[PDB]
Amino acid sequence: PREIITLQLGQCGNQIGFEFWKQLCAEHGISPEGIVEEFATEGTDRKDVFFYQADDEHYIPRAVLLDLEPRVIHSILNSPYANLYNPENIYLSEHGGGAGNNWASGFSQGEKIHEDIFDIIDREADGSDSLEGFVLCHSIAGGTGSGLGSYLLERLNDRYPKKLVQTYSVFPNQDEMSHVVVQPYNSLLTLKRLTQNADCVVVLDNTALNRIATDRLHIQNPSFSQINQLVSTIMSASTTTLRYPGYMNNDLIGLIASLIPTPRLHFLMTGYTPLTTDQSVASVRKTTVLDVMRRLLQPKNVMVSTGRDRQTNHCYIAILNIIQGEVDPTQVHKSLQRIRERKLANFIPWGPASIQVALSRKSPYLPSAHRVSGLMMANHTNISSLFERTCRQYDKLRKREAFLEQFRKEDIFKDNFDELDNSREIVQQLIDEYHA
């Protein structure tokens, strides 16, 4: 009765949501063809959370997988986790459209599958007891996922009044500009819809990902396939207080409420420490819980690139530390004492902040209940570093004579370009303005 429909979209965005469901099948003790384990009732006392209750004695996802190219969805039927998905109830078979590239391509193409894109998500919320909302699992990389992914931010904001909108925006490799070059454009276009039509977002970047991909995995080839494993894990980690009972803030509309002071300051930084083959073997000899929430305030587990000097030009207001698995609970309240002792995150003097600590039980399967995982879902005002990063690459691109005539043949015959520069400079000043 807090059920969320994922709107998986994009060429990359279906892939990052694919392993999110494959992650869920391993903790719910299901198989992608039935129910097998009895650990499913004894471990989780509420299996429904993003699943519709059974009509074949099998829990059905609430997932939709739409993309312009049919190639990405044909890259799922060769896997037999496409028998967890049904052929026309979850993905629609042969979803067509453009090639595609440019943000304005996919934005006008949802207006002609306008009937049909909302008849597969209104055709699943038609069973739901009371729908919480919608999580739009889409990508800013390419023009396919970013173009159409921005359209569902409009139409769910005038046909749904009190439903949660929130996207896991994955900004592409910023050092690359030869992989995609329409990148400062499709990013700032989407950033405008997230500050006057979205509520809250979860920011992620790839150049800071690869900072961890060469330190904890030590693979020297960056690709889409090795980067969906890091992404699916924090998706399931962020809602384990709805998957299993919490206590207080046991809703997702509980967690998010305390992570936001005002809109256009709702961009949350994620951090996720364990990605090593040494962490599994050092939790058997005990690892402490009094230092897995003092290691998250070291900035090198974060997937959002920011200064080493913008971390004392900005003050934290809400920081949430959800530890899962092993957790020693006669000293977990003692671990939250020790944050104020180090002062590695500052706090606002004029208003009251929050050092939020939370806990939740995992899978009743042992090597996924005895390892220390520390999830951070921060709210730091140093998120303006990515906005300056996209915005300096945007004014730079238009002075290199590009997308001033290569963007004005896709139904765009007016200026709306300096509407994107000025609206980003208002957002970036108002984030900083909220602290004194």
Binding site: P1, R2, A40, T41, D45, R46, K47, D48, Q53, A54, D129, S130, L242, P245, G246, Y247, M248, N250, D251
Partner: protein, 121 residues
């Protein structure tokens, strides 16, 4: 400790009264209070009680579909108090882990009077 294990499941109900009346499991209780919320906003009545009795039963089927088999749900009930009508109507509704058998040797009347006080906070 062996005659309880066969008949009463005594030290499990030591855990079971902590999961509802103190809300160890909040999802069960949020999913109750949700449907219940347009019903508590109005002033109390004497036509009040008949739908509080089935807003529980509509809640424990709505929040499970694989944990109805236990006898824990049947041994917890809805407790009502005679509250006068001038008030929101929220300090009327309360749950209690219904016992009256030889299972009430670790529960007594001075116990559930104190469970009534922790329930309101």
């Amino acid at each position: 400790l062996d005659v309880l294990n066969k008949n009463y499941n005594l030290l499990e109900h030591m855990q079971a009264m902590r999961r509802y009346l103190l809300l160890g499991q909040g999802d069960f209780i949020r999913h109750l209070m949700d449907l219940l919320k347009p019903e508590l906003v109005r002033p109390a009545t004497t036509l009040y009680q008949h739908n509080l009795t089935g807003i529980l039963e509509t809640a424990v089927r709505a929040t499970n579909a694989q944990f109805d088999n236990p006898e824990i749900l049947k041994r917890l009930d809805v407790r009502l108090l005679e509250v006068s009508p001038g008030d929101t109507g929220w300090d009327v509704f309360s749950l209690d882990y219904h016992v009256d058998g030889p299972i009430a040797t670790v529960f007594t009347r001075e116990c559930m009077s104190h469970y009534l006080r922790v329930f309101n906070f």
